Amino acid sequence: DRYSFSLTTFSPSGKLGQIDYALTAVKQGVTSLGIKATNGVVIATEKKSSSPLAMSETLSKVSLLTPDIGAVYSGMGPDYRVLVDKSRKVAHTSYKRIYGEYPPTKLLVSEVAKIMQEATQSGGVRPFGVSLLIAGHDEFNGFSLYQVDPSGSYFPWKATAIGKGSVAAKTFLEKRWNDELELEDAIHIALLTLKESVEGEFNGDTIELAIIGDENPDLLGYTGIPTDKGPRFRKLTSQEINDRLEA
Template sequence: MSRRYDSKTTTFTPEGRLMQVEYAMEAINNAGSTVGVLCSEGIVIGAERKQTSKLLERSKHSEKMYQIDEHVVCAAAGLTADANILINHARIISQQYQYTYHELMPVEQLVRQLCNSKQGYTQHGGLRPFGVSFLYAGWDPIYGFQLYCSDPSGNYLGWKAIAIGANNQSASGILKQDYEENFTLRQSLGLVAKVITKSMDTTSPTPDKLEIIVLSRQNNKVVYKTLRDEEVQEILTEFKIVT
């Protein structure tokens, strides 16, 4: 039945669904797990690093984590090529705001403008939705640390803890059970590592299969840090994480 309605983005099914948008969301469910946890000290985002071939050289640059501005970072789940287009657009939006108003752009305003662009690609028959979801982690003087998630339809929501990508249902179940609002940054690191390893299709989690970043504030400045393999191994050992 859906094949009569999935040739164009703007064609609704009798049930009121847009099949092209749902196909884009399905592409995200096939991507590696990505998890974000918000705490009072900062934000932790972790992602599964998938290696398609042993012959590929490990890139020095992440294909999952991106820095948009000095106060905002994000993690992508889905098509990397689509993510690159949107990340460049987000960086331009943020810099234009800073050039105009001489201050950093509020996090939610940046997310909203980017989602408006994503939603525009669901309104025209000659375009297709972006097959990527983002977890945004940022800080601004108005609301402090904030964690948002957006999908191909242009919807976005603020979260305390969220999982997207493969096995996101089971990952969300672990977050609901284990997350506490008074978690420290170290405890949030342990929770993120636990959720990702439980979502991975392996019985032997190793640091080279995980990618974790931390957004915090030190000396009144937002600090963005990518954990080294040695630091990830310390977390796996400290919290006795096994699948």
């Protein structure tokens, strides 16, 4: 019992078995997309619930890792929930408590990918069955949008979609993206693209949208010391989304 044989191994074709199966779980998962605008980033997804009696407020798929970074997933929620808890913890141990500031998006994505990768060679744990669209803002790199897969490979994307409607949505984002997009325009595009992918009812309750954009001092919780400015990640309320839809 000193050891445990690896769950993930190469097939005769050179492909990793569990990795490809994990990607399939993401593919069968609910759709989620992100769009990188000139002055912000948008991450959106739609909530499928077991019964209407479920409280939609508790079905938070988009989550905050740092005040300037946010993530959304498609696949197994429990794996994403565990990853976010570790991602937030890692953002404090590795970077903040050492450098006194929150890590940039690329570094945080790399450390999340490292967590997902170490599960790809282990005798006890299967690879995480989720792909995370991590959106954030950095003082130097600016706005960014990353997609990290179960294999631990993360790629920066101008606009991307994952899940059941990935191919249909990604092609739709292909025809409706440009370097001159405004955050308000991106939200309109994101809501559109999500409308074709969503099966059934489409409103602000079945949809949650978060944006990385201008600061929100009202969300900081305190005043004074202007060098410490608010957060950038904002999760639009169901009220705001409904107003956007009618427009």
